Design a protein around this ligand. Structure first.
Ligand SMILES: [Zn+2]
Lengths: 655, 32, 51, 287
């Protein structure tokens, strides 16, 4: 670095130099031992800079995992007595930093002067700003579902259709597709009630303040109906609404779980508690789950196994690994074993070097379930980082190993690994998209679906088109879901296949000669393609430059809907709104419009079925692909403190 | 610029060697 | 090699569609319809595949 | 209120008994009782199976004998481990895998005593090398169809992995009974004591295979290549003509030296390589 340090100051300035060094270092450096050395040296030149840059001082700090350093840097922006650059950099920190990291900064600031920091770190205003953003512009088509209602039967499509509309209102809280018609809702029962009630949670996600009383409709003393599943789903509902945010719910959920009735509601509590307190590693919750998990009932193992991982996510705790793997060597029940497939895998997250001991122990295990559970470990142990060793082992298992489920999971794990380089990602699945084994094909379709979901890659869709007509019924389901993710919020901007795909969905839902499971992916795909009224998107990466923990964990769980349909609700976590928001000095959101520099057709909504200055107010959405084609009117009294090239909350500066 | 190419290809070569182990590993399994 | 495995795997599902009668077409008719006499069985007026 | 993820695990040993009994009475429909243990509300596992004596002439599974059931069950417990009858199996010679009118009638009897009884059908002729063909089944209530509400309340994409056989669909498949996915349990002690045991020899490696007869075999095979090779010449000129498909169909009545010559060469090289190699290997192992 000494020759690097000397090059920090040179005959040339730092316009792009030292700006492309960071971009290059992140995308090429493999070993972390050297990555940290080069990074913190990259924080040095900013600190000594005459007008130090602060937008990216924290962004480059989060990787190093230095909770204290950010605290002092933030305070030096209060003693200096400017709330502008010390305010904006606080919102980006919340969006892209780990909760343990974020929780590790408040206590420095904490230990109404104390209100300004604490509030801006939880993001509650952002959620409210997000919630206000969603409700402000919601364009969902009643006919789009209406054309699906006529195809609804007494089959699983009913519970598939309830899942579909929930995605179209992820946070909008417009529960009127489910309120205009109810007698149809009472058609499916004895497991849909848990799934349907879950669909309520996703719709109301972010409505934290008015949360408990909205679940109050399902209290024992209020109605007390003949089914306990509907009340159980309320515990599940809290998790979906309160995703990645546990306040008083942790006390509430613990209170409900402490008293245990028949374990048909204890499934929701374990999942609901896990969603409420994901990635926190609180010993209090961990202990309670064990006593529930050790009850050794199949209907409760899946909730316990998955939940146990969620709470202790990214912990590499020795006791948790011993207990989780220990229980998955003597439980005769299989459903609990299934839940531990992701529970142990989740616990080891973003490690890439500490999973070697467990990966060798799991991938070599005799039990078929544990073999795949190890595959997910490598899937998350090396998330994003396109490690060659991980793919090498993964590819060998995906071709030579015996059990089909382990092979299916092996190919799906590829997407998590090569997602940082979407273009190349289809290079490893081209030959595997037509393998002899239908199961390998399904993973291939989902390998692209979760790998390059954000981008509408041309080659990716060309691969999925031929596989959309495969004779294998379930392989067809995987094909459709891949397309829905890949062309999310795409309107003729990526390729002209967006128009055709929607009509392809209809023909497969309107036909009476298609496999009941085959149309399940189609109906669910239609909802995914229009997630949250087109105002949400799925992207495992954040605009700042950090991988989105909730999205990766959620999407991995969503792919696990072969074994538990109601478990297929963990896709709201991966939903991230695509919007740019301007704010006042402290809290006000002004009323300004920023125009675009492209044709209006590209930005246009699908609309129910030549200007170059597209107008959009402050609470306006711009897709990340076209987020760079916007115009900020300099003639306005407000100016953007952040560059208007990477979206999200922006503290607009008045002039 | 050039460093973006020397080390960009280095990944590609270390990639083509991984597809040489998967393709030649499925041959021993496909034939079976 | 992958294609060969696929082909041989579909033959089992393929060598079960009912076979085809062999007949003799005495005279062609109109509207792309022909009149054929089948082996030990009566005559029939049958449509013609577009191929 | 079934879970459409039953996944009836059978055994590594119950299957062999099922097949052996099925083939023994191949013309008829033998019947027996499955001795397994319920574990989950989602899976039913069998462990052992014992046959029931045939009543006599007649390809039917008319009825079971209560006294024989008790005598064997009360006898297996005192030596092995107690087990509860979980289902019955009868072998269909070559019809396929389904339940007939009588088989349905006999099935509701078992379901009356035990709610989650599982009926299994084993086909000993259709199964050939790697496919055993079982497709365990269970009955659907007539009330549901009268009610019209679809049963099995699917809650996972696990049961819709095997396409129902058209032959089975013709009968009461998904109309009078629903299939349950069947998988198997295998362990290394079982596998290593079967795979590494079936086709093995003790000392045949160091045996020189009647050295006098070995060269005689070579002479006969080689002499066949003298005539076979000559026909190869006559099979190269007339080839590479128009309409190779015509050429391809022209090799459907007469031996093709292209393949026949290679077949003999393959056996010739391996026989001598092995036979010769054993010569030097023996010359060092023994003095
Ligand atoms: Zn029968």
């Amino acid at each position: 670095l000494d020759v690097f340090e000397k090059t920090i100051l040179e005959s040339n300035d730092v316009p792009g130099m030292l700006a492309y060094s960071l971009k290059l270092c992140m995308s090429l450096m493999q070993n972390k031992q050297f990555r940290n050395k080069v990074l913190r040296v990259l924080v040095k030149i900013y600190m000594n800079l005459e007008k130090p840059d602060f937008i990216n001082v924290c962004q480059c700090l989060i990787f190093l995992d230095d909770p204290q350093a950010v605290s002092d840097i933030l305070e030096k922006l209060v003693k200096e007595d400017n709330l502008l650059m010390a305010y904006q950099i606080c919102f980006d920190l919340y969006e892209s930093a780990s909760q343990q990291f974020l929780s590790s900064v408040i206590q420095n600031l904490r230990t109404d002067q104390t209100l300004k920091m604490i509030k801006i770190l939880s993001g509650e205003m952002a959620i409210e700003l997000h919630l206000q953003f969603l409700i402000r512009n919601n364009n969902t088509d009643l006919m789009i579902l209406k054309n699906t209602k006529d195809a609804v039967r007494n089959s699983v499509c009913h519970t598939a259709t309830v899942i579909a509309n929930s995605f179209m209102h992820c946070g909008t809280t417009s529960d009127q597709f489910l309120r205009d018609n109810l007698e149809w809702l009472a058609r499916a029962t004895n497991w849909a009630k848990f799934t349907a009630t879950a669909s309520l949670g996703v719709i109301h996600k972010g409505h934290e303040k008015e949360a408990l009383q909205l679940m109050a409709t399902y209290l024992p003393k209020d109605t007390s109906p003949g089914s306990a599943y509907q009340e159980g789903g309320g515990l599940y509902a809290l998790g979906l609404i309160h995703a990645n945010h546990g306040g008083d719910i942790i006390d509430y959920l613990l209170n409900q779980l402490k008293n245990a009735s028949n374990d048909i509601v204890r499934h929701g509590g374990s999942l609901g508690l896990g969603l409420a307190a994901m990635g926190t590693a609180r010993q209090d919750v961990y202990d309670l789950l064990k006593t529930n998990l050790y009850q050794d009932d199949a209907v409760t193992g899946e909730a316990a196994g998955l939940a146990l991982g969620l709470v202790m996510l990214g912990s590499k705790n020795a006791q948790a690994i011993e207990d989780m793997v220990g229980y998955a060597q003597e439980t005769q029940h299989e459903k609990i074993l299934r839940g531990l497939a992701v529970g142990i895998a989740l616990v080891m997250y973003g490690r890439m070097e500490e999973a070697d001991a467990l990966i060798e122990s799991l991938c070599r295990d005799k039990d078929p379930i544990l073999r795949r559970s190890g595959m997910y470990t490598v899937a998350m142990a090396y998330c994003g980082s396109g490690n060659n060793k991980a793919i090498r082992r993964l590819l060998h298992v995906a071709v030579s190993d015996v059990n089909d489920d382990v092979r299916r999971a092996a190919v799906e794990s590829l997407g998590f690994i090569l997602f940082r380089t979407p273009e190349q990602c289809p290079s490893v699945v081209s030959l595997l998209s037509e393998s002899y084994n239908p199961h390998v094909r399904y993973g291939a379709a989902m390998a692209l679906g979760i790998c390059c979901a954000g981008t509408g890659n041309k080659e990716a869709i060309n691969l999925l088109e031929p596989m959309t007509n495969d004779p294998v019924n379930y392989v067809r389901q995987g094909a459709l879901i891949a397309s829905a993710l890949i062309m999310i919020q795409q309107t003729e901007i990526t390729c002209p296949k967006v128009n055709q795909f929607r009509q392809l969905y209809s023909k497969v839902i309107n036909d009476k000669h298609d496999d009941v499971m085959a149309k399940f992916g189609a109906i669910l795909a239609q909802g995914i393609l229009d997630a949250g009224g087109h105002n949400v998107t799925i992207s495992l990466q954040s605009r700042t430059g950090h991988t989105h923990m909730p999205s990766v964990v959620g999407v991995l769980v969503f792919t696990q809907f072969w074994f538990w349909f109601p478990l297929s609700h963990f896709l709201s976590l991966a939903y991230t709104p695509t919007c740019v928001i301007g704010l006042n000095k402290d809290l006000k959101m002004p009323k300004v419009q920023y125009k675009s520099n492209c044709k209006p057709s590209t930005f246009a909504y699908p609309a129910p079925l030549e200007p170059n200055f597209q107008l959009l107010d402050n609470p306006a959405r711009v897709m990340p692909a076209q987020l760079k084609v916007l115009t900020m009117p300099e003639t306005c009294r407000y100016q953007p403190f952040k560059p208007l090239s990477i979206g999200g909350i922006i503290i607009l500066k008045d002039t | 610029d050039l460093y973006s190419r020397y080390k960009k290809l280095q990944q590609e070569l270390e990639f083509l060697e991984v597809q040489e182990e998967y393709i030649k590993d499925e041959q021993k399994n496909l034939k079976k | 090699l992958n294609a060969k495995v696929r082909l041989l795997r579909e033959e089992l599902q393929l060598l079960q569609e009912q076979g085809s009668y062999v007949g003799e077409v005495v005279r062609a008719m109109d509207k792309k319809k022909v009149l054929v006499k089948v082996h030990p069985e009566g005559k029939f007026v049958v449509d013609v595949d577009k191929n | 209120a079934v879970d459409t993820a039953e996944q009836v695990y059978i055994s590594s040993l119950a299957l062999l008994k099922m097949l052996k009994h099925g083939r023994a009475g191949v013309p008829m429909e033998v019947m027996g009782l499955m001795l397994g243990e319920f574990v989950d509300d989602y899976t039913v596992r069998v462990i052992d199976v014992f046959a029931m004596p045939q009543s006599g002439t007649g390809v039917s599974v008319e009825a079971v004998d209560p006294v024989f059931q008790a005598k064997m069950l009360d006898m297996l417990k005192q030596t092995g481990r107690p087990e509860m009858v979980v289902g019955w199996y009868h072998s269909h010679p070559g019809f396929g895998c389904w339940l007939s009118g009588v088989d349905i009638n006999t099935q509701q009897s078992f379901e009356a005593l035990s709610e989650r009884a599982v009926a299994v059908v084993v086909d000993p002729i259709q199964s050939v090398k790697g496919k055993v063909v079982i497709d365990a089944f269970r009955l659907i209530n007539a009330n549901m169809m009268v009610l019209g509400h679809e049963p099995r309340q699917t809650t996972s994409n696990l049961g819709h992995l095997n396409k129902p056989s058209i032959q089975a669909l013709i009968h009461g498949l998904n109309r009078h009974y629903y299939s349950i996915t069947i998988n198997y349990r295998k362990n290394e002690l079982e596998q290593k004591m079967l795979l590494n045991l079936h086709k093995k020899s003790w000392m045949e490696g160091l045996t020189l295979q009647d050295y006098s007869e070995h060269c005689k075999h070579n002479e006969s095979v080689v002499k066949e290549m003298l005539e076979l090779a000559k026909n190869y010449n006559k099979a190269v000129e007339e080839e590479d003509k128009m309409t190779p498909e015509q050429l391809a169909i022209k090799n459907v009545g007469k031996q093709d030296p292209k393949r026949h010559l290679e077949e003999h060469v393959d056996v010739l090289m391996t026989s001598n390589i092995v036979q010769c190699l054993a010569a030097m290997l023996d010359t060092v192992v023994f003095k």
